[PDB]
Amino acid sequence: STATVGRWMGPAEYQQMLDTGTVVQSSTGTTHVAYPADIDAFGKQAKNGAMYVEFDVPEKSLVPTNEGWAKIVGPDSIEGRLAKRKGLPVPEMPTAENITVRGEKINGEVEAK
Ligand SMILES: [Zn+2]
Ligand SMILES: [Zn+2]
Ligand SMILES: [Zn+2]
Ligand SMILES: [Zn+2]
Ligand SMILES: [Zn+2]
């Protein structure tokens, strides 16, 4: 079972994700996403030159946040490091399918599709 999510990212993340077919582990090891996907969810916080990209991941890979967004946890995140110490399985970056560019942020303004 899969869920469509949305994320604002740099082109380098976009390309790596496309090439590997897998979600890229972020600089903190934690990848925040808009669920359900919405360009407007984090469009304000997004940096100029960023791309809004929607993609499909297994629903099971989405970790509960008690907030209006979802997150994907990687092996080197603090959550992953805690999991290993507790003898839990190492979190793994899930597959990402139907990767589609749905927006861009140019000169402080958000454009859809
Ligand atoms: Zn978070
Ligand atoms: Zn809008
Ligand atoms: Zn909050
Ligand atoms: Zn334009
Ligand atoms: Zn444009």
Structure tokens that stand for 77 in this block: 């995140």
Method by which this entry was solved? X-ray
Nearest residue to 59 via CA among 98, 94, 101, 18: 94
Residue ranges covered by each domain of the chain: 2-112
The conformational region for residue 87 under phi > 0 = left, psi -120 to 50 = alpha, else beta, is: left
User: Going along 1-41, which residue ranges are E strands?
Assistant: 2-9, 30-33
* Nearest-ligand number for the alpha carbon of 49: 5
Resolution in angstrom units: 2.2
- The CATH code that applies to domain 2-112 is 3.20.170
Q: Is the dihedral of CA 84, 89, 92, 94 positive or negative?
A: negative
**Residues lying with their CB under 5 A of ligand 2, a single-atom ion:** 40
Nearest residue to 110 via CA among 53, 37, 51, 56: 51
> Nearest 5 degrees, angle CA 28-CA 63-CA 7?
60
- The 3-state DSSP class for residue 84 equals helix
* Nearest-ligand number for the alpha carbon of 33: 1
